[PDB]
Short mmCIF file of C-alpha atoms in Angstrom, two decimals:
data_model
loop_
_atom_site.label_atom_id
_atom_site.label_comp_id
_atom_site.label_asym_id
_atom_site.label_seq_id
_atom_site.Cartn_x
_atom_site.Cartn_y
_atom_site.Cartn_z
CA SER M 1 73.66 -26.40 -39.04
CA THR M 2 69.99 -25.54 -38.50
CA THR M 3 68.45 -27.21 -35.45
CA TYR M 4 64.76 -27.14 -34.54
CA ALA M 5 62.81 -27.54 -31.33
CA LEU M 6 60.87 -30.67 -30.45
CA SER M 7 57.10 -30.66 -30.23
CA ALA M 8 55.45 -31.21 -26.86
CA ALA M 9 54.51 -34.75 -27.89
CA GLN M 10 58.04 -35.45 -29.14
CA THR M 11 59.46 -34.10 -25.88
CA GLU M 12 57.14 -36.34 -23.86
CA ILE M 13 58.12 -39.34 -26.00
CA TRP M 14 61.81 -38.55 -25.52
CA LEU M 15 61.46 -38.18 -21.74
CA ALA M 16 59.41 -41.36 -21.37
CA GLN M 17 61.88 -43.30 -23.53
CA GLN M 18 64.77 -42.07 -21.39
CA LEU M 19 62.89 -43.00 -18.20
CA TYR M 20 62.32 -46.57 -19.49
CA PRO M 21 65.18 -47.36 -21.90
CA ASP M 22 64.26 -51.07 -21.94
CA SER M 23 60.72 -50.59 -23.27
CA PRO M 24 60.03 -50.98 -27.01
CA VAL M 25 56.59 -49.42 -26.59
CA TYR M 26 57.35 -46.57 -29.01
CA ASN M 27 58.24 -48.90 -31.91
CA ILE M 28 55.83 -48.82 -34.86
CA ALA M 29 55.97 -51.89 -37.09
CA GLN M 30 54.24 -53.47 -40.08
CA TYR M 31 55.06 -55.68 -43.05
CA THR M 32 54.07 -55.82 -46.72
CA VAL M 33 53.47 -59.31 -48.11
CA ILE M 34 54.15 -59.20 -51.86
CA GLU M 35 52.90 -62.10 -53.99
CA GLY M 36 55.73 -62.36 -56.50
CA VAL M 37 59.44 -61.79 -56.98
CA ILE M 38 61.35 -58.67 -55.95
CA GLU M 39 64.76 -57.44 -57.09
CA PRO M 40 66.42 -56.33 -53.83
CA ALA M 41 68.90 -53.89 -55.40
CA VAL M 42 66.14 -51.88 -57.08
CA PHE M 43 64.17 -52.03 -53.83
CA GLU M 44 67.12 -50.63 -51.87
CA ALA M 45 67.60 -47.84 -54.41
CA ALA M 46 63.90 -46.95 -54.11
CA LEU M 47 64.11 -47.14 -50.29
CA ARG M 48 67.06 -44.67 -50.39
CA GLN M 49 65.28 -42.34 -52.76
CA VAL M 50 62.12 -42.22 -50.60
CA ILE M 51 64.21 -41.83 -47.42
CA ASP M 52 65.57 -38.64 -48.97
CA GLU M 53 62.04 -37.74 -50.12
CA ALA M 54 60.35 -38.41 -46.75
CA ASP M 55 63.10 -36.58 -44.88
CA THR M 56 61.46 -37.28 -41.51
CA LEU M 57 63.49 -40.50 -41.77
CA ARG M 58 66.61 -38.28 -41.93
CA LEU M 59 65.76 -36.52 -38.66
CA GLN M 60 68.34 -36.71 -35.87
CA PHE M 61 67.48 -35.87 -32.25
CA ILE M 62 70.23 -34.43 -30.05
CA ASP M 63 70.51 -33.17 -26.45
CA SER M 64 73.03 -30.34 -26.63
CA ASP M 65 73.63 -27.34 -24.36
CA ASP M 66 70.86 -25.62 -26.35
CA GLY M 67 68.44 -28.34 -25.22
CA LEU M 68 66.68 -31.16 -27.00
CA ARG M 69 66.85 -30.29 -30.70
CA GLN M 70 66.26 -31.98 -34.04
CA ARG M 71 67.98 -31.50 -37.39
CA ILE M 72 68.27 -33.06 -40.83
CA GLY M 73 71.19 -35.48 -40.98
CA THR M 74 72.50 -38.45 -42.97
CA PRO M 75 71.40 -41.52 -40.98
CA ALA M 76 73.43 -44.70 -41.39
CA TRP M 77 71.13 -47.58 -42.34
CA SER M 78 71.22 -50.98 -44.04
CA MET M 79 68.75 -53.27 -45.82
CA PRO M 80 69.31 -56.94 -44.93
CA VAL M 81 68.07 -59.61 -47.33
CA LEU M 82 66.91 -62.81 -45.62
CA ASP M 83 66.08 -66.11 -47.34
CA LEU M 84 63.72 -68.46 -45.49
CA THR M 85 62.89 -70.90 -48.30
CA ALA M 86 65.03 -73.54 -46.54
CA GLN M 87 63.31 -73.20 -43.15
CA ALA M 88 60.79 -75.74 -41.88
CA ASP M 89 58.24 -72.96 -41.28
CA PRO M 90 59.20 -69.93 -43.40
CA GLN M 91 56.31 -67.69 -42.31
CA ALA M 92 56.96 -68.50 -38.65
CA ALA M 93 60.66 -67.74 -39.15
CA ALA M 94 59.82 -64.37 -40.70
CA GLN M 95 57.45 -63.60 -37.83
CA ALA M 96 60.20 -64.59 -35.38
CA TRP M 97 62.75 -62.31 -37.06
CA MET M 98 60.32 -59.38 -37.16
CA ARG M 99 59.36 -59.95 -33.51
CA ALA M 100 63.04 -60.13 -32.58
CA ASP M 101 63.47 -56.72 -34.19
CA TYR M 102 60.43 -54.72 -33.06
CA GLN M 103 60.70 -55.96 -29.46
CA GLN M 104 64.13 -54.34 -29.02
CA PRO M 105 64.17 -50.85 -27.49
CA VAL M 106 65.92 -48.27 -29.64
CA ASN M 107 68.20 -45.52 -28.34
CA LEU M 108 66.96 -42.18 -29.66
CA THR M 109 70.25 -40.27 -29.62
CA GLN M 110 72.49 -42.31 -31.95
CA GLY M 111 70.75 -45.48 -33.08
CA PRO M 112 68.71 -46.47 -36.14
CA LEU M 113 65.26 -44.90 -35.80
CA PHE M 114 63.99 -47.05 -38.70
CA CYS M 115 64.74 -50.55 -39.97
CA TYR M 116 64.09 -51.84 -43.49
CA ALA M 117 64.45 -55.52 -44.39
CA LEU M 118 63.34 -58.00 -47.04
CA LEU M 119 62.33 -61.58 -46.21
CA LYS M 120 61.85 -64.19 -48.94
CA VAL M 121 59.29 -66.65 -47.56
CA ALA M 122 58.25 -68.42 -50.79
CA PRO M 123 59.58 -68.71 -54.37
CA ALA M 124 57.05 -66.01 -55.32
CA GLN M 125 56.29 -64.28 -52.02
CA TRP M 126 58.33 -61.68 -50.13
CA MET M 127 57.87 -59.67 -46.94
CA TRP M 128 59.03 -56.06 -46.65
CA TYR M 129 59.56 -55.22 -42.97
CA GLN M 130 59.06 -51.61 -41.83
CA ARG M 131 59.79 -50.44 -38.28
CA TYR M 132 59.81 -46.80 -37.16
CA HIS M 133 59.83 -44.87 -33.89
CA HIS M 134 56.80 -43.00 -32.58
CA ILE M 135 58.85 -39.79 -32.26
CA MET M 136 59.01 -39.34 -36.04
CA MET M 137 56.19 -41.39 -37.60
CA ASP M 138 52.50 -42.24 -37.31
CA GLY M 139 50.31 -44.74 -39.14
CA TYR M 140 49.23 -42.60 -42.08
CA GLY M 141 52.81 -41.52 -42.77
CA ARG M 142 53.78 -45.19 -42.60
CA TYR M 143 51.20 -46.10 -45.25
CA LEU M 144 52.23 -43.15 -47.42
CA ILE M 145 55.89 -44.19 -47.24
CA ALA M 146 54.92 -47.75 -48.18
CA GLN M 147 52.87 -46.48 -51.13
CA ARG M 148 55.65 -44.21 -52.38
CA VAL M 149 58.10 -47.11 -52.00
CA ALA M 150 55.82 -49.32 -54.10
CA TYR M 151 55.52 -46.64 -56.79
CA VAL M 152 59.25 -45.86 -56.96
CA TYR M 153 60.20 -49.55 -57.00
CA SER M 154 57.71 -50.22 -59.80
CA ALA M 155 59.06 -47.26 -61.79
CA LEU M 156 62.72 -48.21 -61.33
CA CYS M 157 62.06 -51.87 -62.22
CA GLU M 158 60.38 -51.04 -65.53
CA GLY M 159 62.96 -48.54 -66.74
CA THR M 160 60.92 -45.34 -66.54
CA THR M 161 61.99 -42.59 -64.17
CA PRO M 162 59.57 -42.06 -61.27
CA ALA M 163 57.32 -39.02 -61.21
CA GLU M 164 58.08 -36.24 -58.76
CA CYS M 165 57.41 -36.56 -55.04
CA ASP M 166 54.09 -35.30 -53.71
CA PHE M 167 55.30 -34.99 -50.11
CA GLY M 168 56.25 -31.78 -48.41
CA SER M 169 59.48 -31.60 -46.46
CA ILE M 170 59.38 -31.97 -42.68
CA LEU M 171 61.16 -28.62 -42.36
CA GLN M 172 58.09 -26.90 -43.79
CA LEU M 173 56.24 -28.20 -40.73
CA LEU M 174 59.20 -27.30 -38.52
CA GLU M 175 59.32 -23.68 -39.72
CA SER M 176 55.53 -23.39 -39.54
CA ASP M 177 55.55 -24.63 -35.94
CA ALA M 178 58.49 -22.38 -35.03
CA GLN M 179 56.52 -19.38 -36.29
CA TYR M 180 53.34 -20.59 -34.56
CA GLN M 181 55.15 -21.02 -31.23
CA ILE M 182 55.62 -17.23 -31.06
CA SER M 183 52.29 -16.43 -32.75
CA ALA M 184 49.48 -14.39 -31.26
CA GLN M 185 47.15 -17.06 -32.66
CA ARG M 186 48.81 -19.59 -30.35
CA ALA M 187 48.16 -17.31 -27.37
CA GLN M 188 44.52 -16.97 -28.43
CA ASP M 189 44.17 -20.74 -28.81
CA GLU M 190 45.82 -21.30 -25.43
CA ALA M 191 43.45 -18.85 -23.75
CA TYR M 192 40.44 -20.43 -25.46
CA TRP M 193 41.43 -23.98 -24.52
CA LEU M 194 42.20 -23.02 -20.92
CA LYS M 195 38.82 -21.29 -20.66
CA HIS M 196 36.98 -24.16 -22.38
CA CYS M 197 38.57 -26.83 -20.16
CA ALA M 198 38.30 -24.63 -17.06
CA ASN M 199 38.00 -26.81 -13.94
CA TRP M 200 36.23 -29.61 -15.85
CA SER M 201 35.82 -33.10 -14.37
CA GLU M 202 37.30 -36.56 -14.21
CA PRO M 203 37.32 -38.02 -17.74
CA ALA M 204 34.41 -40.42 -18.07
CA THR M 205 36.22 -43.69 -18.68
CA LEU M 206 35.70 -47.45 -18.72
CA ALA M 207 39.19 -47.94 -17.25
CA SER M 208 39.36 -50.72 -14.67
CA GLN M 209 51.59 -54.30 -24.76
CA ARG M 210 48.08 -53.48 -25.99
CA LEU M 211 44.67 -55.16 -26.01
CA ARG M 212 43.04 -55.27 -29.45
CA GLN M 213 39.60 -56.68 -30.26
CA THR M 214 37.85 -56.50 -33.64
CA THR M 215 34.17 -56.80 -34.60
CA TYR M 216 32.56 -56.75 -38.04
CA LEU M 217 29.01 -55.56 -38.64
CA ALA M 218 26.64 -53.67 -40.93
CA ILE M 219 23.92 -51.21 -39.93
CA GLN M 220 20.71 -50.00 -41.54
CA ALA M 221 21.42 -46.25 -41.44
CA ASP M 222 29.42 -40.35 -45.36
CA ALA M 223 32.67 -40.18 -43.39
CA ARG M 224 32.29 -36.81 -41.62
CA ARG M 225 28.86 -37.66 -40.24
CA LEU M 226 29.85 -41.27 -39.60
CA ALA M 227 32.44 -39.73 -37.29
CA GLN M 228 29.73 -37.47 -35.85
CA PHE M 229 27.51 -40.51 -35.21
CA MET M 230 30.31 -42.59 -33.70
CA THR M 231 31.34 -39.73 -31.41
CA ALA M 232 27.76 -39.19 -30.23
CA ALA M 233 27.25 -42.95 -29.78
CA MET M 234 30.42 -43.47 -27.73
CA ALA M 235 29.63 -40.40 -25.62
CA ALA M 236 26.09 -41.66 -24.97
CA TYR M 237 27.43 -45.13 -24.14
CA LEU M 238 29.92 -43.69 -21.65
CA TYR M 239 27.10 -41.63 -20.14
CA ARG M 240 24.84 -44.69 -19.86
CA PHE M 241 27.51 -46.96 -18.38
CA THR M 242 29.42 -44.63 -16.03
CA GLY M 243 26.60 -42.23 -15.19
CA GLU M 244 28.67 -39.21 -16.22
CA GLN M 245 26.68 -36.38 -17.81
CA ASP M 246 29.82 -34.48 -18.90
CA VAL M 247 31.76 -36.83 -21.20
CA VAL M 248 35.05 -35.83 -22.84
CA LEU M 249 36.21 -37.64 -25.98
CA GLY M 250 39.38 -37.31 -28.04
CA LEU M 251 39.00 -36.44 -31.71
CA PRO M 252 42.19 -36.38 -33.82
CA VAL M 253 42.34 -33.56 -36.37
CA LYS M 254 44.68 -33.14 -39.33
CA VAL M 255 46.04 -29.65 -38.69
CA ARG M 256 45.97 -27.38 -41.75
CA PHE M 257 48.37 -24.43 -41.82
CA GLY M 258 48.78 -23.98 -45.59
CA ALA M 259 50.72 -27.09 -46.61
CA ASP M 260 49.89 -28.08 -50.19
CA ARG M 261 50.94 -31.72 -49.81
CA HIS M 262 51.02 -34.21 -46.95
CA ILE M 263 54.21 -34.38 -44.88
CA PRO M 264 55.04 -37.86 -43.50
CA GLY M 265 55.67 -37.69 -39.77
CA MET M 266 53.31 -34.73 -39.27
CA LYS M 267 51.18 -35.96 -36.38
CA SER M 268 47.50 -35.38 -35.72
CA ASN M 269 46.15 -33.18 -32.93
CA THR M 270 43.65 -34.95 -30.66
CA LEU M 271 41.26 -32.28 -29.40
CA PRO M 272 39.01 -32.81 -26.35
CA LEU M 273 35.29 -32.78 -27.15
CA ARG M 274 33.06 -31.98 -24.16
CA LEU M 275 29.47 -33.24 -24.42
CA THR M 276 26.76 -32.66 -21.81
CA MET M 277 24.00 -35.27 -21.46
CA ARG M 278 20.73 -33.57 -20.48
CA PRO M 279 17.72 -35.69 -19.48
CA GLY M 280 15.56 -36.88 -22.35
CA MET M 281 18.17 -36.24 -25.05
CA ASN M 282 18.14 -38.18 -28.32
CA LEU M 283 20.83 -38.94 -30.89
CA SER M 284 19.82 -35.92 -33.00
CA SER M 285 20.44 -33.45 -30.17
CA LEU M 286 23.71 -35.13 -29.17
CA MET M 287 25.04 -35.15 -32.74
CA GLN M 288 24.17 -31.49 -33.26
CA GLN M 289 25.79 -30.61 -29.92
CA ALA M 290 28.92 -32.49 -30.99
CA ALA M 291 28.96 -30.63 -34.32
CA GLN M 292 28.60 -27.27 -32.56
CA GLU M 293 31.37 -28.16 -30.10
CA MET M 294 33.70 -29.19 -32.92
CA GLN M 295 32.89 -25.90 -34.67
CA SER M 296 33.61 -23.86 -31.52
CA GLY M 297 37.19 -25.13 -31.30
CA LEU M 298 37.82 -25.13 -35.04
CA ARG M 299 39.91 -21.96 -35.26
CA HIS M 300 41.86 -23.11 -32.18
CA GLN M 301 42.65 -26.65 -33.40
CA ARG M 302 46.38 -26.02 -33.86
CA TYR M 303 47.10 -25.73 -30.13
CA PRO M 304 48.73 -29.09 -29.26
CA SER M 305 46.86 -31.25 -26.78
CA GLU M 306 50.04 -32.19 -24.90
CA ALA M 307 50.69 -28.52 -24.11
CA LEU M 308 47.10 -28.10 -22.92
CA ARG M 309 47.61 -31.16 -20.72
CA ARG M 310 50.88 -29.91 -19.22
CA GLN M 311 49.70 -26.29 -18.88
CA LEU M 312 46.78 -27.57 -16.77
CA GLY M 313 46.87 -29.31 -13.40
CA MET M 314 47.49 -32.74 -14.93
CA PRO M 315 50.35 -35.04 -13.79
CA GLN M 316 46.84 -37.44 -16.38
CA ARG M 317 44.49 -37.36 -19.37
CA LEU M 318 41.88 -35.03 -20.84
CA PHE M 319 39.93 -37.98 -22.27
CA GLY M 320 39.83 -41.73 -21.83
CA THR M 321 38.40 -42.63 -25.24
CA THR M 322 39.41 -41.40 -28.69
CA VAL M 323 37.33 -42.04 -31.82
CA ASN M 324 39.06 -42.55 -35.17
CA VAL M 325 36.91 -42.92 -38.29
CA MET M 326 38.94 -43.60 -41.43
CA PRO M 327 38.57 -45.59 -44.66
CA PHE M 328 40.66 -48.65 -45.39
CA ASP M 329 44.05 -47.99 -46.94
CA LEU M 330 44.25 -48.98 -50.59
CA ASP M 331 46.11 -52.19 -51.38
CA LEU M 332 49.42 -51.69 -53.12
CA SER M 333 51.08 -52.87 -56.33
CA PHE M 334 54.82 -53.54 -56.65
CA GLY M 335 55.84 -53.53 -60.31
CA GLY M 336 52.62 -55.34 -61.15
CA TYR M 337 52.28 -57.83 -58.30
CA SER M 338 49.71 -57.45 -55.53
CA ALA M 339 50.76 -56.52 -52.00
CA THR M 340 48.78 -56.13 -48.77
CA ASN M 341 49.88 -54.26 -45.65
CA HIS M 342 49.70 -56.01 -42.27
CA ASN M 343 50.10 -54.18 -38.97
CA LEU M 344 52.52 -55.38 -36.30
CA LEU M 345 52.80 -52.49 -33.83
CA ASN M 346 51.13 -49.08 -33.67
CA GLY M 347 51.17 -46.22 -31.17
CA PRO M 348 50.90 -47.03 -27.47
CA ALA M 349 47.50 -47.05 -25.82
CA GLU M 350 45.97 -43.90 -24.35
CA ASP M 351 43.40 -45.79 -22.26
CA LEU M 352 40.95 -46.71 -25.04
CA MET M 353 40.99 -46.02 -28.78
CA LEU M 354 37.98 -46.70 -31.02
CA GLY M 355 38.82 -47.25 -34.69
CA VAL M 356 36.01 -47.27 -37.24
CA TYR M 357 37.05 -48.53 -40.68
CA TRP M 358 34.66 -48.30 -43.63
CA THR M 359 34.85 -49.15 -47.33
CA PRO M 360 33.25 -46.92 -49.99
CA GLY M 361 30.05 -48.33 -51.44
CA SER M 362 29.49 -50.97 -48.74
CA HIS M 363 27.51 -51.17 -45.51
CA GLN M 364 30.15 -53.22 -43.66
CA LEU M 365 32.08 -51.55 -40.83
CA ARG M 366 35.06 -52.73 -38.80
CA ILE M 367 35.23 -51.70 -35.13
CA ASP M 368 38.59 -51.93 -33.36
CA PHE M 369 39.05 -51.49 -29.60
CA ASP M 370 42.70 -50.73 -28.78
CA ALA M 371 42.91 -50.55 -24.99
CA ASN M 372 45.58 -50.11 -22.35
CA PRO M 373 46.23 -53.49 -20.68
CA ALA M 374 46.67 -51.90 -17.25
CA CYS M 375 43.08 -50.60 -17.22
CA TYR M 376 41.24 -53.22 -19.31
CA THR M 377 41.02 -57.00 -19.32
CA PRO M 378 40.27 -59.03 -22.48
CA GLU M 379 36.89 -60.14 -21.12
CA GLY M 380 35.98 -56.64 -19.97
CA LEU M 381 37.03 -55.17 -23.32
CA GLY M 382 34.95 -57.76 -25.17
CA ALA M 383 31.90 -57.12 -23.01
CA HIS M 384 32.31 -53.37 -23.51
CA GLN M 385 32.61 -53.82 -27.28
CA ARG M 386 29.51 -56.02 -27.48
CA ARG M 387 27.42 -53.71 -25.30
CA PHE M 388 28.58 -50.59 -27.16
CA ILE M 389 27.89 -52.07 -30.59
CA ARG M 390 24.40 -53.21 -29.58
CA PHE M 391 23.65 -49.81 -28.03
CA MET M 392 24.97 -48.09 -31.16
CA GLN M 393 22.75 -50.21 -33.41
CA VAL M 394 19.78 -49.27 -31.22
CA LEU M 395 20.81 -45.61 -31.60
CA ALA M 396 21.10 -45.87 -35.39
CA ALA M 397 17.67 -47.53 -35.57
CA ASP M 398 15.94 -44.41 -34.19
CA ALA M 399 17.73 -41.07 -33.88
CA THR M 400 14.77 -39.41 -32.13
CA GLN M 401 14.44 -41.94 -29.29
CA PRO M 402 15.61 -40.60 -25.91
CA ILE M 403 18.95 -42.07 -24.87
CA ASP M 404 17.70 -42.50 -21.29
CA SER M 405 14.99 -44.97 -22.35
CA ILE M 406 17.38 -47.25 -24.27
CA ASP M 407 18.07 -50.61 -22.61
CA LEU M 408 21.79 -51.18 -21.94
CA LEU M 409 21.96 -54.97 -22.03
CA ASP M 410 24.96 -57.09 -21.05
#
């Protein structure tokens, strides 16, 4: 049958998993707590329909004489139904079962790349467990699969047939990438990114399993320009703390190649953003420089960052900090009962990841620091978060004030 090549990121994930077969670092996990009753047969039927709809769950990765390939197959899976109403601590028992699952390493060749389970923790409260592998799923695809599961289960439980899928097939992305691999546009993007990152520097970093610290706040001062402001603020903070005038940040971009719908499993492309800190620069100048730099690499955004890393002299990172500004995911409804999503495991740490979560029509922001434990301590991460948030509030208070004259308090 038709086999397809792995992306550079998928190849790196495969190689790192084979080098450390005992590490469950590539496992992505979450659970949906549903306040009500669930019919498990209908849920399994919906799970099976969406598995065939989000066919990235049907992907099989082989290592044949051709090389490391991927193809659409029929994966063998099961949906266990657990009852914890008789346990002394039902929620703790569900947490223990989920932790027993997502802490097991998974063999990529022939082993279940996803695991679906249902856990009854109360007479009117269930827990839908979802575990994937990083080689075929990200966070947004995870939420989209959960949402489609909720919709299809609700449709099947109240008789009506579910409306058509609004996902594209993963093979659309596979064919698009196969054509782009031999494109002249890819050669142009490669040349541009090798010229733009020519020589360069050490990534300005605060580097000194995953460490996660959350802070809530509201500030006196739109998603695109909130991302602009957060990028400029983190770059200025790195410049003020490390003393580096050339700061490189990672900015994930949803690559657009003509796909009408979203394809679960289609990863983002984290592009390096180079920002130069000249003396006497304010937040206005830094934000406009960031906008111009994002515009300069806009037509070249499809070149994968892993290829740019490997095609350079890197054994090992273009950037130490990535900035992710995204709204909160909408809460879900199963049949008619409420359900909230709760994260268990996400992608492994690339040094430091800054997540900025905002809600429409409100001033409140949520700031998440997801750091690599080998280069950050909890106390250091907390001090960095506090200092950065205070410095960012000072920035937002006056966009014309020079960054050099801002007090960096600890």
